[PDB]
A paper describes a structure:
A remarkable variation on the theme of mucins arose with the evolution of the complex vasculature in the vertebrate lineage. von Willebrand factor (VWF), a glycoprotein responsible for hemostasis, has a similar domain organization and is homologous to mucins in its amino- and carboxyl-terminal regions. Under acidic conditions, the amino termini of mucins and VWF form noncovalent intermolecular interactions that juxtapose VWD3 assemblies from different CTCK-linked dimers.
The VWF and MUC2 tubules also both display twofold symmetry perpendicular to the helix axis. They differ, however, in that the VWF tubule is a one-start helix, whereas the MUC2 tubule is a two-start helix. The VWF tubule has a helical twist of 86.0° (about 4.2 subunits per turn) and an axial rise of 2.85 nm per subunit. The VWF subregion map contained two adjacent beads along the path of the helix at an overall nominal resolution of 3.4 Å, and both beads were of similar resolution. Aside from the furin cleavage region, the remainder of the VWF bridge is highly ordered. The contact between the bridge and D1 includes a cation–π interaction between Y730 and R202, while the contact between the bridge and D2 includes cation–π interactions between F716 and H460 and between F722 and R442. In the same region, a row of salt bridges is made by the intercalation of residues E714 and D724 from the bridge between R442 and K459 in D2, and another salt bridge was found between Asp720 and Arg505. Further supporting the interaction between beads in VWF, direct D2–D2 contacts are made at the interface between beads (Left).
Numbering used by the authors:
A (entry chain B): 31 to 210, 221 to 378
B (entry chain A): 768 to 864
C (entry chain B): 865 to 1207
D (entry chain A): 1027 to 1188
E (entry chain A): 379 to 702
The structure:
Amino acid sequence: STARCSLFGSDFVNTFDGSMYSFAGYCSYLLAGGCQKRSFSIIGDFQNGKRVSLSVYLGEFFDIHLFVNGTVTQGDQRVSMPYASKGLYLETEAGYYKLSGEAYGFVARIDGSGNFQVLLSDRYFNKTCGLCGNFNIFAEDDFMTQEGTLTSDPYDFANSWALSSGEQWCERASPPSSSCLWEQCQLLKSTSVFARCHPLVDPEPFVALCEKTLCECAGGLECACPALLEYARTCAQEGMVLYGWTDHSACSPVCPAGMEYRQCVSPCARTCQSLHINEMCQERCVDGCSCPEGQLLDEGLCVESTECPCVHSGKRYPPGTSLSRDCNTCICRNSQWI
Amino acid sequence: RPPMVKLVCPADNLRAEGLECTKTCQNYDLECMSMGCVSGCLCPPGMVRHENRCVALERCPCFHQGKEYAPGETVKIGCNTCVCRDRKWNCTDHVCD
Amino acid sequence: ATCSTIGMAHYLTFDGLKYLFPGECQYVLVQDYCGSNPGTFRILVGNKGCSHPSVKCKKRVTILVEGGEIELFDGEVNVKRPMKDETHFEVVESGRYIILLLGKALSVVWDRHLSISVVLKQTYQEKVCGLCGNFDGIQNNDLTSSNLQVEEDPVDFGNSWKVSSQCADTRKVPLDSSPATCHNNIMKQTMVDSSCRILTSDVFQDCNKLVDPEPYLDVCIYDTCSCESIGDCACFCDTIAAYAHVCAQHGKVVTWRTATLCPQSCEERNLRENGYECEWRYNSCAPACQVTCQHPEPLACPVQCVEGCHAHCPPGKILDELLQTCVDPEDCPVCEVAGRRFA
Amino acid sequence: VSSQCADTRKVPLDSSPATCHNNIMKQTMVDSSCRILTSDVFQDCNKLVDPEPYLDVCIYDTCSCESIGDCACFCDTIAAYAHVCAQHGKVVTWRTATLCPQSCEERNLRENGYECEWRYNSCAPACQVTCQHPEPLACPVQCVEGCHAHCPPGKILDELLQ
Amino acid sequence: CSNEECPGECLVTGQSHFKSFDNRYFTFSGICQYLLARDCQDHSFSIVIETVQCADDRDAVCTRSVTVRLPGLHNSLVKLKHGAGVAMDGQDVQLPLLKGDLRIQHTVTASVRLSYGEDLQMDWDGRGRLLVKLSPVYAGKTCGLCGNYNGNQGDDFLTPSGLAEPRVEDFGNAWKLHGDCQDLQKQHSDPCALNPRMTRFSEEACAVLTSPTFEACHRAVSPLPYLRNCRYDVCSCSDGRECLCGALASYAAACAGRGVRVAWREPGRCELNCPKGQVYLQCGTPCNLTCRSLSYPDEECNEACLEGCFCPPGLYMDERGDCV
Ligand SMILES: *[C@@H]1O[C@H](CO)[C@@H](O[C@@H]2O[C@H](CO)[C@@H](O[C@@H]3O[C@H](CO)[C@@H](O)[C@H](O)[C@@H]3O)[C@H](O)[C@H]2NC(C)=O)[C@H](O)[C@H]1NC(C)=O
Ligand SMILES: *[C@@H]1O[C@H](CO)[C@@H](O)[C@H](O)[C@H]1NC(C)=O
Ligand SMILES: *[C@@H]1O[C@H](CO)[C@@H](O)[C@H](O)[C@H]1NC(C)=O
Ligand SMILES: *[C@@H]1O[C@H](CO)[C@@H](O)[C@H](O)[C@H]1NC(C)=O
Ligand SMILES: *[C@@H]1O[C@H](CO)[C@@H](O)[C@H](O)[C@H]1NC(C)=O
Ligand SMILES: *[C@@H]1O[C@H](CO)[C@@H](O)[C@H](O)[C@H]1NC(C)=O
Ligand SMILES: [Ca+2]
Ligand SMILES: [Ca+2]
Ligand SMILES: [Ca+2]
């Protein structure tokens, strides 16, 4: 039992139940956290209608900020990575930035496109209170304003969760008053690639948002591809994962190097600076990327198996870089001093 | 539903107590403000509303901290015992240690 | 020999070397999948939020003997994957400690809070590796990293035995003793030193002849400066308990708990239905393993002096298993077929 | 009394004394550490006495009362609040084996030890009769808390050897 | 010293912050109409407050309007609306108003002043802040939310039944006027346990009270209760810019009542920012400076200082709003 709400595309939102809409704000709205005994909060910052930075809050003492370009802070400092701490292990994954809290229970991602994803646990059933909406199977009553009343206008519902902090004060949010050639959205209705996700989810809202984006099309093929990743991920998490899509018209979701985007990549991500312990990789499939198969990953990039440098006192040394001790000396083999 | 009684508003200066002023037992002593008479219904003047329906005045339970207390019941508060009659608590005083 | 975790930030190898290494992710205590031979067992001591000795520290232990895990966490053991060789699998709850027997030589002892001890016999000579040394009888060389290199300081040595390669290994603490939390007052620092100078005051004077309380004093100075205790004194009594346990192994049992110094009680679980049958006491070290209708035969328990609360029922009417009430020997298993309790 | 005491001057700062709020890692456990005055047993007291002043006391003398191996500086406030509750015929039990534990079995006739004559009781009516004052008295607490001896009616307790 | 009873004051301010007649402070935060005070022994007057929610938050509350009733004139008299205006029996009127014993007048600092015969003085300015001064004549005949005007502060939670509750919620719920309004449950203490972002700012801002700038008044009124109110207001209300300075002014006014003066206004703080052609000056003793007073020079001039907007000492107030 685990839900997933994500902020994707440009000014789009998806809830824990499926009811999804559009929005553009400025005031670091509340994304998740119960409103009876809070005990933590997830806040997603915006700027000029864009999506900049993500943050958590434990009690009233610990802040962490993650940003979209891979820069992490402590509230007033500039910490490095991965930077494990009092829970909340900041890490790296198949190419995205991950923030995981298991004592409390949640996992947050930021990929190259800046699409936020959050996964909660089961014990928050009928108790989550933030912008992603209440977490109950019923999917029509997910517009609870902070007053407890129900509304229908997305903007009115969303403006009641704004948070201000001293220097940063915010105003009311108003829908942009701006209106508007191929229709590739029906790709979700024609090809058999997505045919197997049909009986679990309804593609119609995705087509609607696809045409909404198509209205803009400030580009050639950017009209639809962002609207496609979300459907694939959604019906993947539902219980069955689509295999070998992206081979027809997708726009190659981007990661720095290797570009080996694919589904079902083990989070363990075997490298050569490892003890090669097996049987302890019991994690589900997670989409991401990698670099082919004959290379093993290093801290920056991945290199052929025959150039894993030795390590001594934190210093890195290339193969055949024999160090000298006072009494003895020996050579760098494949990460094995002898 | 009988024996319920209704009343209309003459609408001369809007001083009549309409449905906006339901004199519950807990509100009998408190003054009642009238923004304006509204054609409605109320129990007879000698009858006061209760949680379900209007009941004799001398029977609405006295209220201590968030709980019911029927007439004639006594409660001991640290040093003295007090009993509610006419919805009002009556009891002696004894300055103790 | 014995490898144990003194306090909750320091380690003591098999050959008797003490060092400091605070981590927060999974590591390897002791294994044998490093020699030129097929390994058998493997023990991981992944701790949660213990990079600082704050009270919130919690620790978890996983054991992979053949095909199973035990997940020593919080309350008790798990059997998440039954092992095909339960012929010599035992679990004992004696005093305040829990004892696990996993084979002819391997044994484990757990306090249930923060201390784990591993005991191996002479068979595993020069055949292990990890954070507990190679058990060869030489102290100098028991600091080799995973890549066959002898490091200098423990902080760099420990990183090489990390399991997951995405932990952000601890960098180092450049300062001297009296961590940041101390030496800024020299008023809290001057109370901590005298507070646990009791390791040499009146009762441990006999111990001091046999074992020098030099490392344990330093451990006490640590993880008390950096341990903000509020209403829970468990962060302190544990070091003294560990030292007393070490003394006990040399036949020098001591008693140190008063009514105003780390008091303890075990009368709560004393048959509240009536209670007058007070069957529970607190003993000096309550010899370890006592037979019942669980293992009606002596075992090989390498402590035999486990401190805690004990039951001292008369020669007849031995202790039961589940309800914790001495009963006559009738309530033993009908038969041992399939290794089931069978009442 | 004496005119040479160095009169205490003042404390200018607000709540969270200098000892608090200098880290705000502490001051984050203390508030949660002794919020137990309303956790699971004191919902019944709260209807009779409002525990704001006692929380204020707990926050005070907890930062500024540094503790090392002696947790007594904190259990006393909870004991006082429990005593106040008990005055209003509302006995409560709050002590555990992991939270301010108290044991009175040390004085249990070490000569034999088996004759366990002592227990720990919460209300435990206060003033009894022995060969000291075998007459009723006026004790205005009437179930002082502590460790109590409750041997059968006959063979009453002694004075000196207990 | 010689003891003597002296006038009492009931104060309502902030989100929901009360000061009873004697000295008791507290917070109620309930949403209905309530009876603030009544003669209760002779039935000479009555004050009713209407309450609503603001700042789209759980713990934010306001007071919209106050209605006074004076059986002396037989009618439900002036209602003080959320604006500065007043309505006499449903009809708007223009200030000042004179009658047999009632005087309603606009004051210098953009407020309203309601006065009856030699007592029952009321100050109310628009944005939910009410001061009620009561003469010593009503020394023991008063029941309501302000409590009996006796010398003891230990019996201000006295419900109309006759007993005093230990909890504030039960005491407050006893003074409703409508049976539909719900009875609130446990009062929430910390409002910015729900808005962690606004934590550092609140604590660093509501600390000027315990600073040298106010040290002169630290021994005229204890600034312990005025600090938690500042923290609550900053944490709770939607707009912290004016909430912060809506609370400091309260402490400054409290100090001014004991004779102590202080400036507490410096750049970087909510300065009055008086319009052009007027002066932010401190004490000016307003009885002249409005040439309505010029028309009537022999009515009264007996008033303390108000440090409001003023004019250079060569000008009178113009009717349209000027001072040239
Ligand atoms: C990722 O994005 C964030 C924000 O979009 C970048 O942080 C920003 O970095 C600039 C460069 O220094 C900061 O400007 C500096 O601000 C300080 C303090 O005001 C000022 O003294 C300097 O003169 C300079 O203007 C900016 O404040 C900062 N914004 C934050 C932290 O919110 C970050 O650099 C980006 N990452 C990379 C790798 O570029
Ligand atoms: C959620 O909880 C509320 C209050 O406990 C209850 O009224 C409601 O029915 C619950 N909803 C579901 C879907 O269980
Ligand atoms: C309370 O009772 C006494 C005697 O029963 C009586 O004299 C007194 O008048 C009563 N109080 C009231 C307010 O009626
Ligand atoms: C502990 O148990 C042993 C054996 O039963 C006994 O000899 C010893 O006296 C006990 N210790 C105490 C303090 O009772
Ligand atoms: C405490 O003493 C009273 C006295 O009768 C008794 O009723 C009660 O059961 C005792 N409590 C315990 C826990 O022994
Ligand atoms: C009020 O006092 C006199 C009397 O009218 C007047 O001349 C003066 O200008 C007024 N006060 C000020 C400060 O202007
Ligand atoms: Ca829902
Ligand atoms: Ca060795
Ligand atoms: Ca009073």
